[PDB]
Amino acid sequence: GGLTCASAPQGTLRILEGPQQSLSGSPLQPIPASPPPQIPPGLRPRFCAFG
Amino acid sequence: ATPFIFSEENSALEYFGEMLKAAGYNFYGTERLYSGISGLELEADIFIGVVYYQRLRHMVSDK
């Protein structure tokens, strides 16, 4: 009436919960790159010679 | 003057020389001076500009 060893298991199942990968879009930056410093339009000379 | 904003293609000297030439000065930043001692226009045109100087805390009055 006691507990005895039974037949060895024939296989093992290991369960884990996993989600999946999306598409590669690689959206690097809101406003991207190093935007260049640049000329103010027209500007004009702010200096003249004497005479 | 942020580092790494001006490349080989877009140079800093090109940019600021265009800025200067747009004000009536010359591209390369050289304006020609006179000698305040002899009164003659020096043969070489000088490189003049505006730079930010700091004054250090080490004075001959303390050393």
CSV table of N, CA, C and O in Angstrom, one decimal:
chain,number,residue,atom,x,y,z
A,1,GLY,N,0.8,-1.2,0.0
A,1,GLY,CA,0.0,0.0,0.0
A,1,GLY,C,0.8,1.3,0.0
A,1,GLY,O,0.3,2.4,0.1
A,2,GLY,N,2.1,1.1,-0.1
A,2,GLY,CA,3.0,2.3,-0.1
A,2,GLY,C,3.2,2.7,-1.5
A,2,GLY,O,2.5,2.4,-2.5
A,3,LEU,N,4.1,3.8,-1.7
A,3,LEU,CA,4.5,4.4,-2.9
A,3,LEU,C,5.8,3.7,-3.5
A,3,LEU,O,6.6,3.3,-2.7
A,4,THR,N,5.7,3.4,-4.7
A,4,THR,CA,6.9,2.7,-5.4
A,4,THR,C,7.4,3.5,-6.6
A,4,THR,O,6.6,4.2,-7.1
A,5,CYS,N,8.7,3.3,-6.9
A,5,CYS,CA,9.2,4.0,-8.1
A,5,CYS,C,8.5,3.4,-9.4
A,5,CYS,O,8.4,2.2,-9.5
A,6,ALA,N,8.1,4.3,-10.3
A,6,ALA,CA,7.3,3.8,-11.5
A,6,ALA,C,8.2,3.9,-12.7
A,6,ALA,O,9.5,4.1,-12.5
A,7,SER,N,7.7,3.8,-14.0
A,7,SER,CA,8.6,3.8,-15.1
A,7,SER,C,9.2,5.1,-15.3
A,7,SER,O,8.6,6.2,-15.0
A,8,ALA,N,10.4,5.1,-15.7
A,8,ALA,CA,11.1,6.4,-16.1
A,8,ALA,C,10.4,7.2,-17.1
A,8,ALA,O,9.8,6.6,-18.0
A,9,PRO,N,10.3,8.5,-16.9
A,9,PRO,CA,9.7,9.3,-18.0
A,9,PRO,C,10.4,9.1,-19.3
A,9,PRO,O,11.6,8.9,-19.4
A,10,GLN,N,9.6,9.1,-20.4
A,10,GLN,CA,10.1,8.9,-21.8
A,10,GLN,C,10.5,10.3,-22.4
A,10,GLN,O,11.3,10.3,-23.4
A,11,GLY,N,10.1,11.4,-21.8
A,11,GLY,CA,10.4,12.7,-22.4
A,11,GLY,C,10.2,13.8,-21.4
A,11,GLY,O,9.7,13.6,-20.3
A,12,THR,N,10.7,15.0,-21.7
A,12,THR,CA,10.5,16.2,-20.9
A,12,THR,C,10.0,17.3,-21.7
A,12,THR,O,10.4,17.4,-22.9
A,13,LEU,N,9.1,18.1,-21.2
A,13,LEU,CA,8.6,19.3,-21.8
A,13,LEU,C,8.9,20.5,-20.9
A,13,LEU,O,8.7,20.5,-19.7
A,14,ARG,N,9.6,21.5,-21.5
A,14,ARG,CA,9.9,22.7,-20.7
A,14,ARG,C,9.1,23.8,-21.4
A,14,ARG,O,9.4,24.0,-22.6
A,15,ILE,N,8.3,24.5,-20.7
A,15,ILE,CA,7.4,25.6,-21.2
A,15,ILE,C,8.0,27.0,-20.7
A,15,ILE,O,8.3,27.2,-19.5
A,16,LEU,N,8.0,27.9,-21.6
A,16,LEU,CA,8.4,29.3,-21.3
A,16,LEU,C,7.4,30.2,-22.1
A,16,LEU,O,6.9,29.6,-23.1
A,17,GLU,N,7.2,31.4,-21.8
A,17,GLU,CA,6.3,32.3,-22.6
A,17,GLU,C,7.1,33.3,-23.3
A,17,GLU,O,7.8,34.1,-22.7
A,18,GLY,N,7.0,33.4,-24.7
A,18,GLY,CA,7.9,34.3,-25.4
A,18,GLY,C,7.1,35.1,-26.5
A,18,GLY,O,6.3,34.5,-27.2
A,19,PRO,N,7.3,36.4,-26.6
A,19,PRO,CA,6.8,37.3,-27.7
A,19,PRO,C,7.7,37.3,-28.9
A,19,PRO,O,8.8,36.8,-28.7
A,20,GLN,N,7.4,37.9,-30.0
A,20,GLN,CA,8.1,37.9,-31.3
A,20,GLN,C,8.8,39.3,-31.7
A,20,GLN,O,8.4,40.3,-31.0
A,21,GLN,N,9.7,39.3,-32.7
A,21,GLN,CA,10.3,40.4,-33.2
A,21,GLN,C,9.5,41.2,-34.3
A,21,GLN,O,8.8,40.6,-35.1
A,22,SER,N,9.5,42.5,-34.2
A,22,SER,CA,8.9,43.3,-35.3
A,22,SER,C,9.8,43.6,-36.5
A,22,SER,O,10.9,43.1,-36.5
A,23,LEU,N,9.3,44.4,-37.5
A,23,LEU,CA,10.1,44.7,-38.7
A,23,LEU,C,11.3,45.6,-38.3
A,23,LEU,O,11.1,46.4,-37.3
A,24,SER,N,12.4,45.5,-38.9
A,24,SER,CA,13.5,46.5,-38.7
A,24,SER,C,13.2,47.8,-39.4
A,24,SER,O,13.3,47.9,-40.7
A,25,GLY,N,12.9,48.9,-38.7
A,25,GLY,CA,12.7,50.2,-39.2
A,25,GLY,C,13.9,51.1,-38.9
A,25,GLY,O,14.2,52.0,-39.8
A,26,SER,N,14.5,51.0,-37.8
A,26,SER,CA,15.7,51.7,-37.4
A,26,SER,C,15.5,53.2,-37.5
A,26,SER,O,16.1,53.9,-38.4
A,27,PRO,N,14.5,53.8,-36.7
A,27,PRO,CA,14.2,55.3,-36.8
A,27,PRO,C,15.2,55.9,-35.9
A,27,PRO,O,14.8,56.1,-34.7
A,28,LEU,N,16.3,56.3,-36.4
A,28,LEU,CA,17.4,56.8,-35.5
A,28,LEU,C,17.2,58.1,-34.7
A,28,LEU,O,17.5,58.1,-33.5
A,29,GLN,N,16.6,59.2,-35.3
A,29,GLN,CA,16.5,60.4,-34.6
A,29,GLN,C,15.2,61.2,-34.9
A,29,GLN,O,14.8,61.1,-36.1
A,30,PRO,N,14.6,62.0,-34.0
A,30,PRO,CA,13.5,62.9,-34.3
A,30,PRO,C,13.9,63.8,-35.4
A,30,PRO,O,13.6,63.6,-36.6
A,31,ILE,N,14.7,64.9,-35.1
A,31,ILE,CA,15.3,65.7,-36.1
A,31,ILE,C,16.7,65.1,-36.2
A,31,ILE,O,17.6,65.4,-35.4
A,32,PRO,N,17.0,64.3,-37.3
A,32,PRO,CA,18.3,63.6,-37.4
A,32,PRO,C,19.6,64.2,-37.9
A,32,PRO,O,19.4,65.3,-38.5
A,33,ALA,N,20.7,63.6,-37.7
A,33,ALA,CA,22.0,64.1,-38.2
A,33,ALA,C,22.5,65.3,-37.4
A,33,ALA,O,21.8,65.7,-36.5
A,34,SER,N,23.7,65.8,-37.8
A,34,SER,CA,24.1,67.1,-37.1
A,34,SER,C,23.7,68.2,-38.1
A,34,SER,O,24.5,68.4,-39.1
A,35,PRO,N,22.6,68.9,-38.0
A,35,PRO,CA,22.2,69.9,-39.0
A,35,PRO,C,23.2,71.0,-39.1
A,35,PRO,O,23.7,71.5,-38.0
A,36,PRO,N,23.7,71.4,-40.3
A,36,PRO,CA,24.8,72.4,-40.4
A,36,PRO,C,24.5,73.9,-40.0
A,36,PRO,O,23.4,74.3,-40.3
A,37,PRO,N,25.5,74.6,-39.5
A,37,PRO,CA,25.3,76.0,-39.2
A,37,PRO,C,25.3,76.7,-40.6
A,37,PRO,O,26.0,76.2,-41.5
A,38,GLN,N,24.6,77.8,-40.7
A,38,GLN,CA,24.5,78.4,-42.1
A,38,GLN,C,24.3,79.9,-42.2
A,38,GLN,O,24.1,80.6,-41.1
A,39,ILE,N,24.3,80.4,-43.4
A,39,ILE,CA,24.2,81.9,-43.7
A,39,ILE,C,22.9,82.6,-43.4
A,39,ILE,O,21.8,82.0,-43.8
A,40,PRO,N,22.8,83.7,-42.7
A,40,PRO,CA,21.5,84.4,-42.6
A,40,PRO,C,21.3,85.1,-43.9
A,40,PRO,O,22.2,85.7,-44.5
A,41,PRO,N,20.0,85.0,-44.5
A,41,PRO,CA,19.8,85.5,-45.9
A,41,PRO,C,20.1,87.0,-46.0
A,41,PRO,O,19.6,87.8,-45.2
A,42,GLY,N,20.7,87.4,-47.1
A,42,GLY,CA,21.0,88.8,-47.4
A,42,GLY,C,22.1,89.4,-46.5
A,42,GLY,O,23.2,89.8,-47.1
A,43,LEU,N,21.9,89.5,-45.2
A,43,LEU,CA,22.9,90.0,-44.2
A,43,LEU,C,23.2,91.5,-44.4
A,43,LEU,O,22.8,92.2,-43.5
A,44,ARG,N,23.9,91.8,-45.5
A,44,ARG,CA,24.3,93.2,-45.9
A,44,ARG,C,25.6,93.6,-45.1
A,44,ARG,O,25.8,93.1,-44.0
A,45,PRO,N,26.4,94.5,-45.6
A,45,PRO,CA,27.6,95.0,-44.8
A,45,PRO,C,27.1,95.9,-43.7
A,45,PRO,O,26.1,96.6,-43.9
A,46,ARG,N,27.7,95.7,-42.5
A,46,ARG,CA,27.3,96.6,-41.3
A,46,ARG,C,28.4,97.5,-41.0
A,46,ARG,O,28.7,97.7,-39.8
A,47,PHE,N,29.1,98.0,-42.0
A,47,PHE,CA,30.3,98.8,-41.8
A,47,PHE,C,30.7,99.5,-43.1
A,47,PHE,O,30.6,98.8,-44.2
A,48,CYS,N,31.2,100.7,-43.1
A,48,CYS,CA,31.7,101.4,-44.3
A,48,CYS,C,33.0,102.2,-44.0
A,48,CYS,O,33.3,102.4,-42.8
A,49,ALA,N,33.7,102.5,-45.1
A,49,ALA,CA,35.0,103.2,-44.9
A,49,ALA,C,34.7,104.7,-44.7
A,49,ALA,O,33.6,105.1,-44.9
A,50,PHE,N,35.7,105.5,-44.3
A,50,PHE,CA,35.5,106.9,-44.1
A,50,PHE,C,36.0,107.7,-45.4
A,50,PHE,O,37.1,107.4,-45.9
A,51,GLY,N,35.1,108.6,-45.8
A,51,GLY,CA,35.4,109.4,-47.0
A,51,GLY,C,34.5,109.0,-48.2
A,51,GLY,O,34.7,108.0,-48.8
B,1,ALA,N,30.2,77.1,-31.5
B,1,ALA,CA,31.4,76.5,-31.7
B,1,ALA,C,31.3,75.0,-31.1
B,1,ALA,O,32.3,74.5,-30.5
B,2,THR,N,30.2,74.4,-31.4
B,2,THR,CA,30.0,73.0,-30.9
B,2,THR,C,31.0,72.1,-31.7
B,2,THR,O,31.1,72.2,-32.9
B,3,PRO,N,31.6,71.2,-31.0
B,3,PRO,CA,32.5,70.3,-31.8
B,3,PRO,C,31.7,69.3,-32.6
B,3,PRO,O,30.6,68.9,-32.3
B,4,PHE,N,32.3,69.0,-33.8
B,4,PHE,CA,31.8,68.0,-34.7
B,4,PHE,C,30.6,68.4,-35.5
B,4,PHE,O,29.7,67.6,-35.8
B,5,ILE,N,30.4,69.7,-35.7
B,5,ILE,CA,29.3,70.3,-36.4
B,5,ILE,C,29.7,70.7,-37.8
B,5,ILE,O,28.8,70.9,-38.7
B,6,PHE,N,31.0,70.8,-38.1
B,6,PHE,CA,31.5,71.3,-39.3
B,6,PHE,C,32.4,70.3,-39.9
B,6,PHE,O,33.5,70.0,-39.3
B,7,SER,N,32.1,69.7,-41.0
B,7,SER,CA,32.9,68.6,-41.6
B,7,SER,C,34.0,69.1,-42.6
B,7,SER,O,34.4,70.2,-42.5
B,8,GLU,N,34.6,68.1,-43.3
B,8,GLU,CA,35.6,68.5,-44.4
B,8,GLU,C,34.9,69.1,-45.5
B,8,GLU,O,35.4,70.0,-46.1
B,9,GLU,N,33.7,68.6,-45.9
B,9,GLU,CA,32.9,69.2,-47.0
B,9,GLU,C,32.4,70.6,-46.6
B,9,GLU,O,32.6,71.5,-47.4
B,10,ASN,N,31.7,70.7,-45.5
B,10,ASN,CA,31.3,72.0,-45.0
B,10,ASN,C,32.4,72.4,-44.0
B,10,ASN,O,32.4,71.9,-42.9
B,11,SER,N,33.3,73.3,-44.3
B,11,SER,CA,34.4,73.6,-43.4
B,11,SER,C,34.0,74.8,-42.6
B,11,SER,O,33.0,75.4,-42.9
B,12,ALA,N,34.7,75.0,-41.5
B,12,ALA,CA,34.5,76.2,-40.7
B,12,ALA,C,35.1,77.4,-41.3
B,12,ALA,O,34.4,78.5,-41.3
B,13,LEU,N,36.3,77.3,-41.9
B,13,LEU,CA,36.9,78.5,-42.5
B,13,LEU,C,36.1,79.0,-43.7
B,13,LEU,O,35.9,80.2,-43.8
B,14,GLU,N,35.6,78.1,-44.5
B,14,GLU,CA,34.7,78.5,-45.6
B,14,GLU,C,33.5,79.2,-45.1
B,14,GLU,O,33.1,80.3,-45.6
B,15,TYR,N,32.8,78.7,-44.1
B,15,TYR,CA,31.6,79.3,-43.5
B,15,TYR,C,31.9,80.7,-43.0
B,15,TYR,O,31.2,81.7,-43.4
B,16,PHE,N,32.9,80.8,-42.1
B,16,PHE,CA,33.1,82.1,-41.5
B,16,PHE,C,33.8,83.1,-42.5
B,16,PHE,O,33.6,84.3,-42.3
B,17,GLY,N,34.5,82.6,-43.5
B,17,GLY,CA,35.1,83.5,-44.5
B,17,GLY,C,34.0,84.1,-45.4
B,17,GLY,O,34.0,85.2,-45.8
B,18,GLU,N,33.0,83.2,-45.7
B,18,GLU,CA,31.8,83.7,-46.4
B,18,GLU,C,31.1,84.8,-45.6
B,18,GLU,O,30.6,85.8,-46.1
B,19,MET,N,30.9,84.5,-44.3
B,19,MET,CA,30.3,85.5,-43.4
B,19,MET,C,31.0,86.8,-43.4
B,19,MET,O,30.4,87.9,-43.5
B,20,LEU,N,32.4,86.8,-43.3
B,20,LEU,CA,33.2,88.0,-43.4
B,20,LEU,C,33.0,88.7,-44.7
B,20,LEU,O,32.8,89.9,-44.7
B,21,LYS,N,33.2,88.0,-45.8
B,21,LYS,CA,33.1,88.6,-47.1
B,21,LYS,C,31.8,89.2,-47.4
B,21,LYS,O,31.6,90.0,-48.2
B,22,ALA,N,30.7,88.7,-46.7
B,22,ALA,CA,29.4,89.3,-46.8
B,22,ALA,C,29.3,90.6,-46.0
B,22,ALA,O,28.2,91.2,-46.0
B,23,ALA,N,30.3,91.0,-45.2
B,23,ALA,CA,30.3,92.2,-44.4
B,23,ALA,C,31.2,93.2,-45.0
B,23,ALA,O,31.4,94.3,-44.4
B,24,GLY,N,31.9,93.0,-46.1
B,24,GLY,CA,32.8,93.9,-46.7
B,24,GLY,C,34.2,93.7,-46.3
B,24,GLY,O,35.1,94.3,-46.9
B,25,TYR,N,34.5,92.7,-45.4
B,25,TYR,CA,35.8,92.4,-45.0
B,25,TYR,C,36.3,91.3,-46.0
B,25,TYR,O,35.6,91.0,-47.0
B,26,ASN,N,37.5,90.7,-45.8
B,26,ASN,CA,38.0,89.7,-46.7
B,26,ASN,C,37.9,88.3,-46.2
B,26,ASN,O,37.8,88.1,-45.0
B,27,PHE,N,37.8,87.4,-47.2
B,27,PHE,CA,37.6,86.0,-46.8
B,27,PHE,C,38.5,85.5,-45.7
B,27,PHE,O,38.0,85.0,-44.7
B,28,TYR,N,39.8,85.6,-46.0
B,28,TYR,CA,40.8,85.0,-45.1
B,28,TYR,C,41.0,85.7,-43.7
B,28,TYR,O,41.8,85.2,-43.0
B,29,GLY,N,40.2,86.7,-43.5
B,29,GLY,CA,40.2,87.3,-42.1
B,29,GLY,C,41.3,88.3,-41.9
B,29,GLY,O,41.5,88.7,-40.7
B,30,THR,N,42.1,88.6,-42.9
B,30,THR,CA,43.2,89.6,-42.8
B,30,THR,C,42.8,90.9,-43.2
B,30,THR,O,42.3,91.1,-44.3
B,31,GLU,N,42.9,91.9,-42.3
B,31,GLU,CA,42.8,93.3,-42.6
B,31,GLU,C,44.2,94.0,-42.5
B,31,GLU,O,45.0,93.6,-41.6
B,32,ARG,N,44.5,94.9,-43.3
B,32,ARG,CA,45.8,95.5,-43.4
B,32,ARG,C,45.9,96.7,-42.5
B,32,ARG,O,45.1,97.6,-42.5
B,33,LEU,N,47.0,96.7,-41.7
B,33,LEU,CA,47.2,97.7,-40.6
B,33,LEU,C,48.3,98.7,-41.1
B,33,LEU,O,48.9,98.5,-42.1
B,34,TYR,N,48.4,99.8,-40.3
B,34,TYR,CA,49.5,100.7,-40.4
B,34,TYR,C,50.4,100.6,-39.2
B,34,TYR,O,49.9,100.1,-38.2
B,35,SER,N,51.6,101.1,-39.3
B,35,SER,CA,52.5,101.1,-38.2
B,35,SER,C,52.3,102.3,-37.4
B,35,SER,O,52.4,103.5,-37.9
B,36,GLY,N,51.9,102.2,-36.1
B,36,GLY,CA,51.7,103.3,-35.2
B,36,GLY,C,52.9,104.1,-34.8
B,36,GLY,O,52.8,105.1,-34.1
B,37,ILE,N,54.1,103.6,-35.3
B,37,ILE,CA,55.3,104.2,-34.9
B,37,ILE,C,56.0,104.9,-36.1
B,37,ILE,O,56.6,106.0,-35.9
B,38,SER,N,56.0,104.3,-37.3
B,38,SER,CA,56.5,104.9,-38.5
B,38,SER,C,55.4,105.5,-39.3
B,38,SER,O,55.7,106.4,-40.2
B,39,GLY,N,54.1,105.1,-39.2
B,39,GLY,CA,53.0,105.6,-40.0
B,39,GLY,C,52.9,105.0,-41.3
B,39,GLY,O,52.1,105.6,-42.1
B,40,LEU,N,53.5,103.9,-41.6
B,40,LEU,CA,53.5,103.3,-43.0
B,40,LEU,C,52.7,102.1,-43.0
B,40,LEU,O,52.7,101.3,-42.0
B,41,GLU,N,52.0,101.8,-44.1
B,41,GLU,CA,51.3,100.6,-44.2
B,41,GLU,C,52.2,99.4,-44.3
B,41,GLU,O,53.0,99.2,-45.2
B,42,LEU,N,52.2,98.5,-43.3
B,42,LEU,CA,53.0,97.3,-43.2
B,42,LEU,C,52.8,96.5,-44.5
B,42,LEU,O,51.8,96.6,-45.1
B,43,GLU,N,53.9,95.8,-44.9
B,43,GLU,CA,53.8,95.1,-46.2
B,43,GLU,C,52.9,93.9,-46.1
B,43,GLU,O,52.3,93.5,-47.1
B,44,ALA,N,52.8,93.3,-44.9
B,44,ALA,CA,52.0,92.1,-44.7
B,44,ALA,C,50.6,92.5,-44.2
B,44,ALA,O,50.6,93.4,-43.3
B,45,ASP,N,49.6,91.9,-44.6
B,45,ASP,CA,48.2,92.2,-44.1
B,45,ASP,C,48.0,91.2,-42.9
B,45,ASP,O,48.3,90.0,-43.0
B,46,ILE,N,47.5,91.8,-41.8
B,46,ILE,CA,47.5,91.1,-40.5
B,46,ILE,C,46.2,90.4,-40.3
B,46,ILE,O,45.2,90.8,-40.9
B,47,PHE,N,46.2,89.4,-39.5
B,47,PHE,CA,45.1,88.6,-39.1
B,47,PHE,C,44.5,89.1,-37.8
B,47,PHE,O,45.1,88.9,-36.7
B,48,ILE,N,43.3,89.8,-37.9
B,48,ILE,CA,42.8,90.4,-36.7
B,48,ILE,C,41.3,89.8,-36.5
B,48,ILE,O,40.7,89.4,-37.5
B,49,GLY,N,40.9,89.8,-35.3
B,49,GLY,CA,39.6,89.3,-35.0
B,49,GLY,C,39.2,89.5,-33.5
B,49,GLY,O,39.9,90.3,-32.8
B,50,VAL,N,38.1,88.9,-33.1
B,50,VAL,CA,37.6,89.0,-31.7
B,50,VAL,C,37.7,87.6,-31.0
B,50,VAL,O,37.1,86.7,-31.5
B,51,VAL,N,38.4,87.5,-29.9
B,51,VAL,CA,38.5,86.3,-29.2
B,51,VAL,C,38.2,86.6,-27.7
B,51,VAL,O,38.4,87.7,-27.2
B,52,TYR,N,37.8,85.5,-27.0
B,52,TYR,CA,37.3,85.6,-25.6
B,52,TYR,C,38.5,85.2,-24.7
B,52,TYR,O,38.9,84.1,-24.7
B,53,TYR,N,39.0,86.2,-23.9
B,53,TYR,CA,40.1,86.0,-23.0
B,53,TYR,C,39.6,85.8,-21.6
B,53,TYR,O,38.7,86.6,-21.1
B,54,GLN,N,40.1,84.9,-20.9
B,54,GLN,CA,40.0,84.7,-19.4
B,54,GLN,C,41.2,85.2,-18.7
B,54,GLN,O,42.3,85.2,-19.3
B,55,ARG,N,41.0,85.7,-17.5
B,55,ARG,CA,42.1,86.2,-16.7
B,55,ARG,C,42.3,85.2,-15.5
B,55,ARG,O,41.4,84.9,-14.8
B,56,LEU,N,43.5,84.7,-15.4
B,56,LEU,CA,43.9,83.7,-14.5
B,56,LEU,C,44.2,84.2,-13.1
B,56,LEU,O,44.5,85.4,-12.9
B,57,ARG,N,44.1,83.4,-12.1
B,57,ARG,CA,44.1,83.8,-10.7
B,57,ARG,C,45.5,83.9,-10.1
B,57,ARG,O,45.6,84.1,-8.9
B,58,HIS,N,46.5,83.7,-11.0
B,58,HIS,CA,47.9,83.7,-10.6
B,58,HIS,C,48.5,85.0,-10.9
B,58,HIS,O,48.5,85.3,-12.1
B,59,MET,N,48.8,85.8,-9.9
B,59,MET,CA,49.3,87.2,-10.2
B,59,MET,C,50.6,87.3,-9.5
B,59,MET,O,50.9,86.7,-8.5
B,60,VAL,N,51.5,88.2,-10.1
B,60,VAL,CA,52.9,88.4,-9.6
B,60,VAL,C,52.7,89.0,-8.2
B,60,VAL,O,53.7,88.9,-7.4
B,61,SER,N,51.6,89.5,-7.8
B,61,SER,CA,51.4,90.2,-6.5
B,61,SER,C,51.3,89.1,-5.4
B,61,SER,O,51.3,89.5,-4.2
B,62,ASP,N,51.1,87.9,-5.8
B,62,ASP,CA,50.9,86.7,-4.9
B,62,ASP,C,52.1,85.8,-4.9
B,62,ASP,O,52.2,84.9,-4.1
B,63,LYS,N,52.9,86.0,-5.9
B,63,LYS,CA,54.1,85.1,-6.1
B,63,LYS,C,55.3,86.0,-6.3
B,63,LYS,O,55.8,86.0,-7.4
